[PDB]
Amino acid sequence: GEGMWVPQQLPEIAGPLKKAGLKLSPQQISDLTGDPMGAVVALGGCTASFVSPNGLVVTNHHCAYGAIQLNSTAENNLIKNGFNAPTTADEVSAGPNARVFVLDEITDVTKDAKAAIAAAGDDALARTKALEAFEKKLIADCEAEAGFRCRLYSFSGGNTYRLFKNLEIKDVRLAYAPPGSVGKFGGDIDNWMWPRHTGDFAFYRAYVGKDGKPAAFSKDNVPYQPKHWLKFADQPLGAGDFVMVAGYPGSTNRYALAAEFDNTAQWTYPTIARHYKNQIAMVEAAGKQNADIQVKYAATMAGWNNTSKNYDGQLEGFKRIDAAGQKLREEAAVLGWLKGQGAKGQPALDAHAKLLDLLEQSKATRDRDLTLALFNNTAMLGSATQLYRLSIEREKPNAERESGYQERDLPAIEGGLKQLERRYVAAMDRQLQEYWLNEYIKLPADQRVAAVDAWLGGNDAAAVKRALDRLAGTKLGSTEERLKWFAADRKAFEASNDPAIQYAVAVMPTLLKLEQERKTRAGENLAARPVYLQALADYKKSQGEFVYPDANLSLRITFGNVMGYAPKDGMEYTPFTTLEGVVAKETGQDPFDSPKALLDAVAAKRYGGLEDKRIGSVPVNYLSDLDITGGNAGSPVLDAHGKLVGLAFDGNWESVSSNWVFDPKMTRMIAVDGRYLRWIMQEVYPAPQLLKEMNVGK
Amino acid sequence: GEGMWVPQQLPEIAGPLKKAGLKLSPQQISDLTGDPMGAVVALGGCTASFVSPNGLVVTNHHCAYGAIQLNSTAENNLIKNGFNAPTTADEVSAGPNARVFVLDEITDVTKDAKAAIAAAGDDALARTKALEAFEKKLIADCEAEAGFRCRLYSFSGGNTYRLFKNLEIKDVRLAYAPPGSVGKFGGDIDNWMWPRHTGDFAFYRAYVGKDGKPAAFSKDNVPYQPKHWLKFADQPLGAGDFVMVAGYPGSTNRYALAAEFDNTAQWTYPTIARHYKNQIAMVEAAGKQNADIQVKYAATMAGWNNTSKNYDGQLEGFKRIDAAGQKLREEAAVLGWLKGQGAKGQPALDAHAKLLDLLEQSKATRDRDLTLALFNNTAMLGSATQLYRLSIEREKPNAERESGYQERDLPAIEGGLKQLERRYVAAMDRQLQEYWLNEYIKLPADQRVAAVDAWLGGNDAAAVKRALDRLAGTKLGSTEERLKWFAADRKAFEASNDPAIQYAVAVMPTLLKLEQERKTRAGENLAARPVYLQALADYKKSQGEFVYPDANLSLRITFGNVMGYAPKDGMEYTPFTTLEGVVAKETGQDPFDSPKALLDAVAAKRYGGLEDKRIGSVPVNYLSDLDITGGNAGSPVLDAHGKLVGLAFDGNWESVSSNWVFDPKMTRMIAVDGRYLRWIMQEVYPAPQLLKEMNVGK
Ligand SMILES: [Zn+2]
Ligand SMILES: [Zn+2]
Ligand SMILES: [Zn+2]
Ligand SMILES: [Zn+2]
Structure with a gap:
């Protein structure tokens, strides 16, 4: 349903969350540095999240495209072929501008911000300049600690101000990317579209110095060890189940x-x-x-x-x-x-x-x-x-x-x-x-x-x-x-x-x-x-x-349920797509040219133990009534127990209006199912070391 | 599912009939002059059925189109406006070519046919001419009593021959027709299409002379009194329920x-x-x-x-x-x-x-x-x-x-x-x-x-x-x-x-x-x-x-269940359409121009006590996996108890190929629900006296 809730308000919506199917306490998810919300990280335009105690990060393929392209040659095309690092030493740099930001501390500074504005009296220009000054000194003083990037966010027109202090990780390396015809199956043709069959995921790893502090790329850096990280679901995600997304919508x-x-x-x-x-x-x-x-x-x-x-x-x-x-x-x-x-x-x-x-x-x-x-x-x-x-x-x-x-x-x-x-x-x-x-x-x-x-x-x-x-x-x-x-x-x-x-x-x-x-x-x-x-x-x-x-780049939770929609009487979009649906779109020309190992596995019905019999197959993508907007690409989708069931990567065309409105009948997020990540990594473009690292291998 | 079953064979598929949900006995529905099947009548190219003991007959609107047009003038345009006869004296003649054929008797004549053929020897042409002679004498004998027309049918390439003797009713009158934008909503645009929203029905009344024998139109004629007529379902028809159709498919x-x-x-x-x-x-x-x-x-x-x-x-x-x-x-x-x-x-x-x-x-x-x-x-x-x-x-x-x-x-x-x-x-x-x-x-x-x-x-x-x-x-x-x-x-x-x-x-x-x-x-x-x-x-x-x-114009039963179909991964056609779907297609222009009383009733939610809460509305049309072809227009659709739940009027575009094959996944009949007939007759183009005659008055 509609709403981009700040974590701090989740106890207040205990009733709605429980009715939708949430099984964790709202008090647990309200902690922005806790389990699981402290696993959620910002890449600068995309959301991502930690998925192991050694700094593994999952996000969308198009979020990683920069990094994949950067390590691609004219004559070796990771965009086409995919990328795999069998050991952490094989991971390649995403380059010196790549970042993972991780929340260290949050402070409510509303009282101070309002006092500064109030000191300007009835002078409107003075009020602006006073907030400008408050912000710049705040950020300066916060960032005087090396390693950290700080942001001041204004909520509801300035009813509330919050200061976020983020660890600024500057050595991010590519660990895995599926081939481009998975990552971006259906290309621009399928943009905004359901039914959708796109394996839109990829993996980084975050690195810090041996002293634990952020550092630029060096072979002496080691993996970051996050305080919190997400685990794969052990219950199979079904139509009607509770889902929630946590991520950084930019603006509404x-x-x-x-x-x-x-x-x-x-x-x-x-x-x-x-x-x-x-x-x-x-x-x-x-x-x-x-x-x-x-x-x-x-x-x-x-x-x-x-x-x-x-x-x-x-x-x-x-x-x-x-x-x-x-x-x-x-x-x-x-x-x-x-x-x-x-x-x-x-x-x-x-x-x-x-x-x-x-x-x-x-x-x-x-x-x-x-x-x-x-x-x-x-x-x-x-x-x-x-x-x-x-x-x-x-x-x-x-x-x-x-x-x-x-x-x-x-x-x-x-x-x-x-x-x-x-x-x-x-x-x-x-x-x-x-x-x-x-x-x-x-x-x-x-x-x-x-x-x-x-x-x-x-x-x-x-x-x-x-x-x-x-x-x-x-x-x-x-x-x-x-x-x-x-x-x-x-x-x-x-x-x-x-x-x-x-x-x-x-x-x-x-x-x-x-x-x-x-x-x-x-x-x-x-x-x-x-x-x-x-x-x-x-x-x-x-x-x-x-x-x-309104969205303002801070962490928000949206919740609801896995569900299709029906634009017209006598028809419905079903909540899931399936492996066979991917093959049925094969043309093999760009952008419907899946890898052969995918065509072979589906023909063989090698479901890898990941099938959901309620749908007769391994799920690929699914729809839900979650409320996202630009910024939320790459956001993790969690189930009722706060376990990972997929990644947000698009919406239906009825979501194009997300700055202004949410239509509970028609607006739907499109996610790639966690089982499809696992299926690709088991049957198509193998990443056995990552599966084991995530305890689903192994 | 697949099959245009001859009634005489229905006992041998008792198991499949029962599994699909039939509650009458196979024996009971095998009885071609019994209840319900003795209610089904042939019009010459469409199927129809009796629905009252005073000779009321229901069929599709395009089946009655000749009669409607014949009684239409520019000043009173029945095609556009509909027709209702509140008393039986108001009913207007369907013309001298109109017919209702009611089955009187069937005989297996296979032994004498095969004998006549055998007696012509090795000469191929003589064999044809022997069969011609056999057939002509047979029909001549059967037709010797005035009032009957007889037909000889060959089954399975001449493995079996049966002779049907039908009462030939020649005075057929129009009793009701809905306005044209109900009878043919969507016109040629929606033809062979689902989702469908078409009220494809009309009513006739069969007349004979005061001596009970067939006669051409006369104002001295009175309504035929059928031995058997269909009754409206008292059970609401839902997804998955048993349905069967009886009618006269032409050729496969x-x-x-x-x-x-x-x-x-x-x-x-x-x-x-x-x-x-x-x-x-x-x-x-x-x-x-x-x-x-x-x-x-x-x-x-x-x-x-x-x-x-x-x-x-x-x-x-x-x-x-x-x-x-x-x-x-x-x-x-x-x-x-x-x-x-x-x-x-x-x-x-x-x-x-x-x-x-x-x-x-x-x-x-x-x-x-x-x-x-x-x-x-x-x-x-x-x-x-x-x-x-x-x-x-x-x-x-x-x-x-x-x-x-x-x-x-x-x-x-x-x-x-x-x-x-x-x-x-x-x-x-x-x-x-x-x-x-x-x-x-x-x-x-x-x-x-x-x-x-x-x-x-x-x-x-x-x-x-x-x-x-x-x-x-x-x-x-x-x-x-x-x-x-x-x-x-x-x-x-x-x-x-x-x-x-x-x-x-x-x-x-x-x-x-x-x-x-x-x-x-x-x-x-x-x-x-x-x-x-x-x-x-x-x-x-x-x-x-x-x-x-194969079909050969004789009476057949096809049976199955109410169900939609899924032509692409990630979507489904739902088994029913609804009143709100009619209105969503409105443009004010032919063929998507419903009567204003229809638009008014749907806007006010005057569901007239006919709504099925499982679909949140009054149903309009529905899909099922029955096996029909040319000749089946107008066939009654019956439920598990032999009660009327619809009329056949089209198929989806995937069938068509049906003549050569029946595709269990994609082949569907499209019917108009008996509730929709009732609904139109209550709330849109009223015929309270006909619903009274059919014991479905408010
Ligand atoms: Zn913890
Ligand atoms: Zn930041
Ligand atoms: Zn706070
Ligand atoms: Zn209702």
């Missing part, structure tokens, strides 16, 4: 105001989808012509194409369940309940009204803001503005620097700067500059930016050509020029005759004013949002509903 | 030789498909700017579509299931077994070789025979050749006239020649003549017909155009002129300058020679087929299996 916006949601559906999503489709067509058209373009812009185009299809998909989904109407009616109920109460209801009504006013304010300049932002996100303008901005911040002391530009941020910046070379071709970037300039000159007089207008020196076709021609002369194309600016001082930037840097210098005072305006609105939001969300929570309580905060 | 070819099957799949089906699509195209093109054509050729075009699509989808089914390989392999086993028998097995092996030889004889002229038969079946040539043939037969004693051309056949002939008016337009029929002649002159020289060659005077497009010009002068376009020829002497035909007549007179000697060749072949088949089929039966029995004869 489940409590958006009716007007905010309407603006997203009516303007934001259609407008962004449009520009994205125009960009896609431009890149498609040029990559045919050219070919450097084709290879370097392929991932950028895929990103646009992805967002574009998901926005279109959500808009249809909304109309399908009347999400806007449902939201409007619940909001009306809330406002009615508050209005009924006297004076006592007024602060929350006032807060609702302030939230509406801020949405009008950001709506008044929505076209300008989007155009300027995406114009400045083109490659040469992006790097110019980012570099110049850094040089301004450098000229203050670190403690005053804008997050993103502190000393902790510099590796990330240099990272991006080097990466840019993989996705930049000047002929193509000129076309993207042109597109965004033509969007710019379509803005009304009252949405223009004087500094840009003055730079452009006119606003017809010929103005834009002159401007493209000037910018052509920049030298920030090359990595090596860019690295010189990364270290250059503000007055160098101001002396430069580089036409991209001169753009940056011309517009920066304006960009800073716009930034200050966002921060001002954001400080008003600090005041009004928690108040409104508390009133929402109180209303829901009166109605007997428990409330969960 | 489940025991064909591998080479007979191959000929059909490789030649017959693809050839016919192709011709029919050519014809369908010409008729659809011509109809777009001539609506006389389009109105009059619509039944005809839809006949072609049905066969075309069925053959295209049998052919797919054959490949899905490797039907070719199955047959060859199964025939391999039988032949091996037979060789394993003594001398004992030699007759069946000789029979097998004979049948192969007959097949090669038929194949040597297959193109000639099909082209000439389809040419001659165009409207004017069909009419001329038939009317000339009749004049030839009228010159013999009735006893010696060909079946189809006896006294007893005359109304049916006169029927046909009147009804041709409804489906003929000269300029369309010319295009059809032209297609077929163009096929004719494309024939290989050794597949030509000397008489057609002489009449053409050449073998080219020029000769074709001359023939069409010649034929266009016929007078047989008018009903009046056809009825003259109906009555004419053969001398008159042979003196006629009517060019269609001239054609018939020129070709008839040929047609009678080809008829004689067919009959000679059938005379050989008469000897070989039953020996081979008896061998297949013995073989099947040596392997522990029960055997049933």
Whole structure:
């Protein structure tokens, strides 16, 4: 069912958990450093988990793809063939940017965070700056212990703040990956789709120094020895059984105001989808012509194409369940309940009204803001503005620097700067500059930016050509020029005759004013949002509903049951797929080209002792009514006894709307069954040492 | 499961019947004039049944479609609106061609038939003619009492012969029909499809004279009083429950030789498909700017579509299931077994070789025979050749006239020649003549017909155009002129300058020679087929299996259980559809335009006391693993106690291939649930007096 619950609130939902079938105590699972929640780890974008007392980590295949590719040659293709390390000495480095983060300590810092905000009085900009400062000092002081990375998370609009201190493991090595036609069986064709037959798993091992402390790759490091780790289920998972997922969903916006949601559906999503489709067509058209373009812009185009299809998909989904109407009616109920109460209801009504006013304010300049932002996100303008901005911040002391530009941020910046070379071709970037300039000159007089207008020196076709021609002369194309600016001082930037840097210098005072305006609105939001969300929570309580905060990168549990769904009368998706289902999709061409040893074993009905007779086969994937979103790939699925029954890896297309809604009839997570991991590792691409390490071998 | 069981054999499958859930005794349901089976009646191409002691009869809506349309006018459009007769005086005549045939008596005549055949000796043609003589006398004797029509059926290639004497009711009236968007919801879109949501039912009432004998329509007639009629189930039908169907399946070819099957799949089906699509195209093109054509050729075009699509989808089914390989392999086993028998097995092996030889004889002229038969079946040539043939037969004693051309056949002939008016337009029929002649002159020289060659005077497009010009002068376009020829002497035909007549007179000697060749072949088949089929039966029995004869238009029982099917891993069709499914398909446009009272009742959940809580609604249609074919439309579906739970009206698209094989996994009948009939009659298009008559009033 719906909900991304923080572990601390699980005792409060004891009743719902027990009814769904949970057999462990909610008090046990509420401990974020305990058994099993302390086994759950973050990879930076994916979830994973510990599965042995010697640092073995399981996650999805696409979560490990980076590492698999990295250790692949032109002439030895782990992507195709799989990877296996028969001893730990055979495990290969995932490279110096790979991480496993493990929770060390959590602290509720709400009282301190609220005091700092409260000290700013009625000054909205001051409130923002005060929270910024609180956070930066907190993180600094927490991270003064080497080995650790800290994060401050705000819950429910700032009703609650929590500080997480994570051990930062920096020597992560690949231990196993199934072949690519298992890991990614069905490729993009089966993306978002059920029925699903994908063995989406892989294994790392975490390493530390012999002193126990994190260290970069070294042959003297040894496996990390986790305090907690997960065990394979010994009861066979069946339709209707309790399941829960623990993982790190990135962000949701489940409590958006009716007007905010309407603006997203009516303007934001259609407008962004449009520009994205125009960009896609431009890149498609040029990559045919050219070919450097084709290879370097392929991932950028895929990103646009992805967002574009998901926005279109959500808009249809909304109309399908009347999400806007449902939201409007619940909001009306809330406002009615508050209005009924006297004076006592007024602060929350006032807060609702302030939230509406801020949405009008950001709506008044929505076209300008989007155009300027995406114009400045083109490659040469992006790097110019980012570099110049850094040089301004450098000229203050670190403690005053804008997050993103502190000393902790510099590796990330240099990272991006080097990466840019993989996705930049000047002929193509000129076309993207042109597109965004033509969007710019379509803005009304009252949405223009004087500094840009003055730079452009006119606003017809010929103005834009002159401007493209000037910018052509920049030298920030090359990595090596860019690295010189990364270290250059503000007055160098101001002396430069580089036409991209001169753009940056011309517009920066304006960009800073716009930034200050966002921060001002954001400080008003600090005041009004928690108040409104508390009133929402109180209303829901009166109605007997428990409330969960929006996702915010922290560890959450979602629970429910293994179950199919039926989009149409007279048919149902069954909760499981099976081995025979995989073979029935064989074409053998990419992406339906299973390994031969899989075809042979299924034909032989070598079930490896893993069959579930209720389904007549070994299970492959299954559906459940769990509530996940981006961040949850790789999350472990646990059973009623907190034992591992699979990994989360996708959802059905009805899950594409997970930022905004959950449809209990149709939304389903797709998981790969723990028995299918075992079956692949027994019958297809053998990992006897891992099976034994996990006590299911052996 | 598989099998179209003759009732007389039901005692010998007591075990399977009971295992499947039958609660009546096998003996009781074997009784063809008893309860319930004596309630089942034939309409001539559809099955129906009695459902009251005052002669009320239920069947499908497309079975009653002729009657509905006949009583329809633009001002009162019964097809669209439905029909109800609240009193028996309101019921309207289904027309002079409508029939209800009620079984009076069956006799096994196998001994006298086999004797008549034996007395003709070794001459194949004489054997056919002996069987013809036997059959004609038998029927003449049986029909001597007014009011009855009789038929002789041969089972299992002539192993058994039975004579059925039926009361021929000729006054049939429409009592109820649901609106068209209920009777045919989904139209041709949902045809052969599941999920299905179609209320495919209608009611008639059978009338006889006040003396109790059959009579043509008269207002002095009164309702027939049946000895046995079905009652509605009092038990709610659920998933897994026993169901059976009784009706008159037309033809199957489940025991064909591998080479007979191959000929059909490789030649017959693809050839016919192709011709029919050519014809369908010409008729659809011509109809777009001539609506006389389009109105009059619509039944005809839809006949072609049905066969075309069925053959295209049998052919797919054959490949899905490797039907070719199955047959060859199964025939391999039988032949091996037979060789394993003594001398004992030699007759069946000789029979097998004979049948192969007959097949090669038929194949040597297959193109000639099909082209000439389809040419001659165009409207004017069909009419001329038939009317000339009749004049030839009228010159013999009735006893010696060909079946189809006896006294007893005359109304049916006169029927046909009147009804041709409804489906003929000269300029369309010319295009059809032209297609077929163009096929004719494309024939290989050794597949030509000397008489057609002489009449053409050449073998080219020029000769074709001359023939069409010649034929266009016929007078047989008018009903009046056809009825003259109906009555004419053969001398008159042979003196006629009517060019269609001239054609018939020129070709008839040929047609009678080809008829004689067919009959000679059938005379050989008469000897070989039953020996081979008896061998297949013995073989099947040596392997522990029960055997049933191919369909031959006689009454059969098929039994099984309510069940869905799963065509892909990860999904299932559920056994029932529901009211909410009807409404989810609504578009407001034909064919997905339910009556508003339907939409209103489902929205208010007026389930009228008919809901089955196991499916959360009133059921609509359901699937089961019964074995039906063409002729079974309208068959009553009965439960374990012999009570009415549905009507058969279609099958899923996977069957179709059924003619050649029954696929236990995928073959399903689609029925309309008796609750849905009740529901429509209560809540949508009300007939409280009929439900009262059926003891299901509220
Ligand atoms: Zn512990
Ligand atoms: Zn972290
Ligand atoms: Zn805490
Ligand atoms: Zn109900």
